[PDB]
């Protein structure tokens, strides 16, 4: 190195090039994977992360843990990105993608150390991934019966498998049944915004309930609200986007009068405007009034005198859910409140749940919505319950899209490894080593399962390999029995697209990391 | 690490200042912190429990026995301590009583789980065993529960339950009186068809001075305000109250309004209009036959003097919730303007009086003797504000217990009898299960047995000997009501001693403690900055 | 306010870690600072004679050596000063110079130290910045040129304000004579220049024998 | 809870840290292995420059903090001390062994099983080397020594000039040959005085059939060349006789002070006259000689050399037959110096070597000695030549002492890897994994050799492994055990017929040392670093 | 060609083998290299490859 | 035990009783041994070395230790062994397989 009186790049620029840079990238990826290794399988463990402000997040989802990890290593951020991608496209497998990518990089590290050209590794990864995806699509088990009970059972089993790694795994059957019930009453888009999730502190997990309708929290009642009845047996719900209170007619409106008679007339006109709106609401026959905009004390007292229920400042999402449940239409104007735009539910009732008041709309026969009311002993408990239910909901939605499943517990990946090794045995030999390394790396998930469970991973892997070699596709890891078992007959089912996306994303991440040869870091401006 | 090639190795932003606990050492640290919190809490358990005296960041002092309040005001930094605080608060919101038992039970569970882990058992297996034992204990509690009558015709079981709840608090000097007023407050305002008890209709508020025995239940509303004009009478009988939310001022449009005076005639007309509006509003109020007028937004001198002149006592600036409570109690509607005021919208009250409080110049208005007042208020007196706050939270605990009785009318006998019986059932069940979860179930039973031990320790008796004797008696004679004689009454049968606890409270305690212990056992890494 | 007798008892033994954490850093701090107390404060507060041989002394002092002439060692930090000063033995004589850039007198005596180290191999001439040494700013005004001499942990040379005693243009002869007449510079020895080097090592004693 | 003033690392963290440190130490010198390896060069804080290729020297110069890295550095130092060659290969093998063993441990394989597997693999590798891969040097002749020296000097600053440097090394080693009791020939290397001097090119390096002193005559008066040298070796100074500490001179009669002062130097005069009267021509002393004695030697036309190094004087006395004298005292209590203790040489001169002079004692009688004068471009180059020359001398000594050599270029490593991979299946259940990992880690040497030449390492190592597997599986093609690596063309080559040898002791000692170092590091699973 | 990970002054990560993008994300300071980079950018604008 | 409300003096006496009973049990389980039986001494040495890094070298070190002890004491009429009579010399170099039992 020479001073070079006028330097080429900006002062402080840091560069790294060659094999050591790639080896460091692989090591960083391994470090990232080590942070979520233990959160895989029924015997997984939660992770607690504290931010700068001091709020603690307890989670088992790999994507959440990686997001909470403020990773700044350019090669390591690829694992976080692919975890986010798997969460977005599928919703489950965020740990598997990271483990697979890191294991791929670790397996090809010795070949990189001896100066193997990266493009050969990239081509081998592409070929192996294409073959694995084709094999998964070929051997995935699907039933062409279109039976309602059979598909319900399949969705329930998939949800149970997707839930048997979280803190709600003890009540996994109960939660899976509720999740399947909630998903099956969505119409065609399966929008997540159409499934409300309410968390109420205090109560056992089994106290959580699914509302065949809509339910939301009480919203800042005014004076005179306590005189309103809180139960109806055939109410008509008026869904409104209207501010029902005295106020200026317009922001730019100005009133100019020169007679006290005109003054009194103006005051009476304002009062008559509000009372005309209220009379139009009353004559519509509705007994429950819901408004996005605030509802004043005058309107609250008016509705109390007429024995009605009013609730202003209802959020947009809750109003839309109520529309989809009762079956009305949000009206920004009360001038045409026909019976067509009035929601209808069997029973409306306000009750107390864990020291809070919740308005309940139940008995809707044509509802297209739900509302999960989750009970727990802590805020993070409820947050993790919501995360687990979200994973289950995404899994059930994907299974609704297509009923193509493979046995979990590492059985699918053991079969893929066997097939890939058999394929690699019949090629020249430069790609054979790399494809064999890919197949060997595919074994990480059952090994990680055994390690988390406390098994001896070597014996379990040997037994699985011997079984798959002699036939038997769906033999995975029996966690309870300390042994192996046919996981398909044990109903350890997952959608095939989960593993397909996991393999695709892991392969793409590995190829992207391997392709990079030089890292350049410009100095950061505005050091402050 | 800094790479094997010596090149810089940065992964996590500011990883030098961050810390990480890995594996079983982190779990041991969590268990020890939770044990410390639980052992701090366990001294305030039972009738002989001692109160903690908390000081906030501003120097304000709170002498209290409520576990939830103590943990809420405790300034902790450990995450597991925050989890304990949240668990106690959750038990408070869901039930309102037993916020101290949950913390002690969770601490005992984690303490047993520590020595279970030391022997090489995966924490997930411990959590599964705890869940199984909790299911067994809950089923046993359902089996051994007993039902009580919750009718207004006879309130003895309710009074006994409220007395049991209030025994541990400082208001035990006025024990039966506080229990009776809490029971009457709950029963007066409640929907008899097993529906909710709206706590917003119970106005609990206290004033310093007097004696704690002077705390009373008013079947009406007590208002901080007083009569606007000092020369109006302080006593109104058979009052026909007119609740109004419109200030006794000339009307004013909400819209931006300009009134233009262009001549002397206009000025005279405006002055006459103001005078006539005042007189008209007063005459409109008087035309309904009302005796008392209650306003929310105050009024000016002219309205005040016309109200005085027409023998109309009035009160101004009454709060919105106070207006609602008065309207509910007096059976009268809330009228937004005078033109809509009619005789049918008037409330009724047998007595409206102004209350003095010694040499303090402060006056308070009481409305009572209503016809069928659906709203009640509790007026607490004390020798200092600290005992007043403690009485407030103790009465809240009693109200919550009676509310739970309203929701479900099944009770179990406290004093450790329920916990001892549950431990016996869990131990009996564990003898039949495969030995792998047997250790976890036995540890759960041992943790369940900490409540009677803590009760005996607080009462001065030897814990192990008393607990063993009571358990042996429970096994010998099949009486699951035998507990720890904390008050030294000379007997162990809590069914005879009338120590009664709601079944819902015990079930919530067991469930919440089990779930929190499971969550703590499932955490293995921490990444504090 | 009562209970003056506290007997903090368990407290200090339960907080040994953090107190010792402060104590080790404080120990480093005052060890470094006391290593320079013995110089600071009290110094600043406080025709053969025609040198015919001086010219020829310069003349054969010009011939430094064969392989270049090296330079004077520079101390980077006070911790570096301490960890280079506590090492070696008593027999090693160390002269240290405090300096700043631009001020008069530094360059001349710096070259003097360079040539002295060239022709006094035994001594360990070195120089340190005033900012690095962290001395009192009173030194930073009025005590920069200080021919400081150390010998195995204790002072053997007590020379500050060398500009007054030598001048500004003083050469190697002047400072060398001034140092030797105080009995500080070790006696010189006749040293010759070999080819380059001979002694690779002397560790194994398998040399020779002629057993029958 | 522990309340220990320090930092503690436990479990996989400390194992990963140790593997990282070992890998860093390996990667430091991994680029300086094999003929295509390139020398490094180090600059100290003061500014000293050291261009070197020896792994032991590089690791000695570096300042290291991590204890495992210190372990590998001391392992390299031990290999240098006890063998003299292979100081880089041992470090690389040890680090690769540690890495593979830790990879096994991470798979929940207990460290004790891995250690036992490594022990068995090392024992069987040594046995297989001693039984199959050794070549006797009896039938190869001097060409075996020449080829071993050339192989040792490859990858060094004197690699290309090996055709001449190997001849010089072999001649120097054969010159200092001696036999001791039990009739075992011995070659005391480090008795060959290595002298450096910049100047002419490498090819002008001179091998002295005698001894070379980096000293000159004490005075310009004495002659600088004596034909029939009679060397007298003394271990005492020739100065004015000052009386001992316990003796004090007190004068009460002034008439005797002059006699005392005269005798004070007449004693030394008489000693020198006794030494000279026997016919001595060259006088070497470890002590000093002052001007009077120098003049005494000048007048007699002899040579006087002062401050002669003790080891140099011992070597000269042993070679020329002279005897070291601490004092001129005999068994009769008087001062005598017989002629029987005079050394002899055929010529003693003071040659001029690049504006500097040194004394050459040429053609000593009664014993043949040797010395080497290295001429280079500058001091750094001469130092590197000296280090490489010492490595070659040690290699030749090992070859001449133990008459077994093995093919180079990674042939031994590939053969051992194949044999151990085959043999692991016949031992234990979990030790077989450790033995297989030992075999795999043994392949780091050919991989590094291929990588340093920018050749396709994978294909070359695959071809080598295929050749050795075919050799071991076919009993009629045993001649393929000698297939090594030809780095010039990047192809496998029969190294035995290509003259690429090295002592078997190098491989055996390197394997044992690396295995024991890896075992030592592998035992650690917890670190307590007490704060200073 | 091998992709290059480039981190600009705003910690926005670019990985690509496009020469124009790499030069754009590099804080080039030598003005002669600046002229060559500008020529490369002009080629990118005129043609695209 | 203390959490149950047991004074930390009954615990000490109970521990003393348990210690006495355990000493009796251990003495009951014991088996007599004579110094003339080399196999038991070798087995004890090997068991002692099983847990150390020199376990792989136990086949060499165990007879070394047994011989070292037996050569510094009289097998009959000896109630103690003075380990100061067995000098250990540490020399760097070689391997643990090069350990020796020089009798001078
Ligand atoms: N009952 C079970 N038995 C064996 N393996 C299971 C079981 N349930 C889930 N798994 C495994 O757990 C893995 C998923 O773990 P989880 O952490 O829930 O999601 P992710 O795929 O993001 O890791 C799947 O690969 C599946 O094979
Ligand atoms: N009179 C009594 N005799 C025996 N035990 C009692 C009596 N009163 C209360 N207890 C017991 O004291 C325990 C603590 O009750 P308390 O302090 O009121 O609330 P918490 O359960 O939140 O601590 C209860 O479990 C109850 O069984
Ligand atoms: N001419 C050659 N052809 C092929 N291989 C060689 C040749 N010379 C040396 N080697 C091999 O190169 C390896 C590296 O030796 P080297 O690194 O010089 O020794 P050291 O390890 O002591 O530095 C040796 O194991 C040797 O087998
Ligand atoms: Mg999952
Ligand atoms: Mg209580
Ligand atoms: Mg070599």
CSV table of C-alpha atoms in Angstrom, one decimal, chain D residues 144-303:
chain,number,residue,atom,x,y,z
D,144,UNK,CA,18.9,-39.4,-1.8
D,145,UNK,CA,20.7,-36.8,0.4
D,146,UNK,CA,20.8,-34.4,-2.5
D,147,UNK,CA,17.1,-34.8,-3.3
D,148,UNK,CA,16.1,-34.5,0.4
D,149,UNK,CA,18.1,-31.2,0.6
D,150,UNK,CA,16.5,-29.9,-2.6
D,151,UNK,CA,13.0,-30.8,-1.3
D,152,UNK,CA,13.7,-29.1,2.0
D,153,UNK,CA,15.1,-25.9,0.3
D,154,UNK,CA,12.1,-25.7,-2.1
D,155,UNK,CA,9.7,-22.8,-1.3
D,156,UNK,CA,12.7,-21.0,0.2
D,157,UNK,CA,14.9,-18.1,-1.0
D,158,UNK,CA,17.5,-20.6,-2.2
D,159,UNK,CA,15.0,-22.9,-4.0
D,160,UNK,CA,16.1,-22.4,-7.6
D,161,UNK,CA,19.8,-22.6,-6.7
D,162,UNK,CA,19.1,-25.9,-5.0
D,163,UNK,CA,21.4,-27.8,-7.4
D,164,UNK,CA,24.4,-26.1,-5.8
D,165,UNK,CA,23.0,-25.4,-2.3
D,166,UNK,CA,22.2,-29.1,-1.8
D,167,UNK,CA,25.8,-30.1,-2.7
D,168,UNK,CA,27.1,-27.5,-0.3
D,169,UNK,CA,24.8,-28.7,2.5
D,170,UNK,CA,25.6,-32.4,2.0
D,171,UNK,CA,29.3,-31.6,2.0
D,172,UNK,CA,29.0,-29.6,5.1
D,173,UNK,CA,27.1,-32.3,6.9
D,174,UNK,CA,29.5,-35.1,5.8
D,175,UNK,CA,32.4,-32.9,7.0
D,176,UNK,CA,31.2,-32.8,10.6
D,177,UNK,CA,30.4,-36.5,10.8
D,178,UNK,CA,31.7,-38.4,13.8
D,179,UNK,CA,31.0,-41.8,15.4
D,180,UNK,CA,30.4,-42.3,19.2
D,181,UNK,CA,30.2,-45.3,21.4
D,182,UNK,CA,27.8,-48.1,20.4
D,183,UNK,CA,29.1,-47.5,16.8
D,184,UNK,CA,26.3,-45.1,15.8
D,185,UNK,CA,27.4,-42.3,13.4
D,186,UNK,CA,26.3,-38.9,14.6
D,187,UNK,CA,26.1,-35.5,12.8
D,188,UNK,CA,26.3,-32.6,15.3
D,189,UNK,CA,24.6,-29.9,13.2
D,190,UNK,CA,24.8,-26.3,14.7
D,191,UNK,CA,28.6,-27.0,14.8
D,192,UNK,CA,28.7,-25.6,11.2
D,193,UNK,CA,29.4,-21.9,11.7
D,194,UNK,CA,27.0,-20.0,9.4
D,195,UNK,CA,28.4,-16.6,8.5
D,196,UNK,CA,26.4,-13.9,6.6
D,197,UNK,CA,27.8,-11.0,4.6
D,198,UNK,CA,26.0,-9.0,1.9
D,199,UNK,CA,27.8,-8.5,-1.4
D,200,UNK,CA,28.0,-10.9,-4.3
D,201,UNK,CA,25.2,-13.2,-5.5
D,202,UNK,CA,24.0,-16.4,-3.9
D,203,UNK,CA,26.2,-18.5,-6.1
D,204,UNK,CA,29.3,-17.0,-4.5
D,205,UNK,CA,28.4,-18.5,-1.1
D,206,UNK,CA,31.5,-20.4,0.1
D,207,UNK,CA,31.9,-23.6,2.0
D,208,UNK,CA,35.0,-23.5,4.2
D,209,UNK,CA,37.0,-26.7,4.6
D,210,UNK,CA,37.9,-25.6,8.1
D,211,UNK,CA,36.5,-23.0,10.4
D,212,UNK,CA,35.6,-19.3,10.0
D,213,UNK,CA,35.9,-16.7,12.8
D,214,UNK,CA,34.1,-13.4,12.8
D,215,UNK,CA,37.1,-11.9,14.5
D,216,UNK,CA,40.3,-10.0,13.5
D,217,UNK,CA,43.8,-9.7,14.8
D,218,UNK,CA,44.0,-7.3,17.8
D,219,UNK,CA,46.7,-5.1,16.2
D,220,UNK,CA,47.8,-4.1,12.7
D,221,UNK,CA,51.4,-5.2,13.5
D,222,UNK,CA,50.8,-9.0,13.4
D,223,UNK,CA,50.9,-10.7,10.0
D,224,UNK,CA,47.5,-11.6,8.5
D,225,UNK,CA,48.6,-15.0,7.1
D,226,UNK,CA,50.5,-17.9,8.7
D,227,UNK,CA,51.2,-21.0,6.7
D,228,UNK,CA,52.0,-23.7,9.3
D,229,UNK,CA,49.7,-22.5,12.1
D,230,UNK,CA,50.3,-23.7,15.7
D,231,UNK,CA,47.0,-22.7,17.3
D,232,UNK,CA,47.0,-22.1,21.0
D,233,UNK,CA,43.6,-21.9,22.7
D,234,UNK,CA,43.3,-20.0,26.0
D,235,UNK,CA,40.4,-19.4,28.3
D,236,UNK,CA,41.9,-16.5,30.2
D,237,UNK,CA,42.8,-12.9,29.6
D,238,UNK,CA,46.3,-11.5,29.0
D,239,UNK,CA,46.5,-8.3,30.9
D,240,UNK,CA,48.5,-6.8,33.8
D,241,UNK,CA,48.1,-9.1,36.8
D,242,UNK,CA,46.0,-7.3,39.3
D,243,UNK,CA,45.9,-9.1,42.7
D,244,UNK,CA,42.7,-10.7,43.9
D,245,UNK,CA,40.1,-9.1,46.2
D,246,UNK,CA,41.5,-10.8,49.3
D,247,UNK,CA,45.1,-9.5,48.7
D,248,UNK,CA,46.1,-6.0,49.6
D,249,UNK,CA,49.4,-4.3,49.0
D,250,UNK,CA,50.7,-2.1,51.8
D,251,UNK,CA,54.1,-0.5,51.5
D,252,UNK,CA,56.2,0.6,54.5
D,253,UNK,CA,59.6,0.7,52.8
D,254,UNK,CA,59.4,2.9,49.6
D,255,UNK,CA,62.3,1.0,48.0
D,256,UNK,CA,60.0,-1.9,47.0
D,257,UNK,CA,57.2,-0.1,45.2
D,258,UNK,CA,59.1,-0.1,41.9
D,259,UNK,CA,59.8,-3.8,42.1
D,260,UNK,CA,56.1,-4.5,42.9
D,261,UNK,CA,55.0,-2.4,39.9
D,262,UNK,CA,57.5,-4.1,37.6
D,263,UNK,CA,56.5,-7.6,38.6
D,264,UNK,CA,52.8,-6.7,38.2
D,265,UNK,CA,53.4,-6.9,34.4
D,266,UNK,CA,56.4,-9.1,34.4
D,267,UNK,CA,54.1,-12.0,35.4
D,268,UNK,CA,52.1,-11.6,32.2
D,269,UNK,CA,55.3,-11.1,30.3
D,270,UNK,CA,56.6,-14.4,31.6
D,271,UNK,CA,53.4,-16.2,30.8
D,272,UNK,CA,53.4,-15.0,27.2
D,273,UNK,CA,57.1,-15.9,26.8
D,274,UNK,CA,56.3,-19.4,28.1
D,275,UNK,CA,53.4,-19.7,25.6
D,276,UNK,CA,55.5,-18.4,22.7
D,277,UNK,CA,58.7,-20.4,23.4
D,278,UNK,CA,57.0,-23.6,22.3
D,279,UNK,CA,56.6,-22.4,18.7
D,280,UNK,CA,53.0,-21.3,18.7
D,281,UNK,CA,51.9,-19.1,15.8
D,282,UNK,CA,48.2,-18.4,16.4
D,283,UNK,CA,46.9,-17.5,19.8
D,284,UNK,CA,43.1,-17.4,20.5
D,285,UNK,CA,41.7,-16.3,23.8
D,286,UNK,CA,38.2,-15.7,25.1
D,287,UNK,CA,39.4,-12.9,27.3
D,288,UNK,CA,40.9,-9.6,26.5
D,289,UNK,CA,44.5,-8.7,25.4
D,290,UNK,CA,45.9,-5.3,26.2
D,291,UNK,CA,48.5,-3.3,24.3
D,292,UNK,CA,51.6,-4.7,26.1
D,293,UNK,CA,50.8,-8.3,25.3
D,294,UNK,CA,49.7,-7.4,21.8
D,295,UNK,CA,53.2,-5.8,21.2
D,296,UNK,CA,54.8,-9.0,22.7
D,297,UNK,CA,52.9,-11.1,20.1
D,298,UNK,CA,53.8,-8.6,17.3
D,299,UNK,CA,57.5,-8.7,18.0
D,300,UNK,CA,57.5,-12.6,17.8
D,301,UNK,CA,55.6,-12.5,14.4
D,302,UNK,CA,52.5,-14.4,15.7
D,303,UNK,CA,48.8,-13.8,15.7
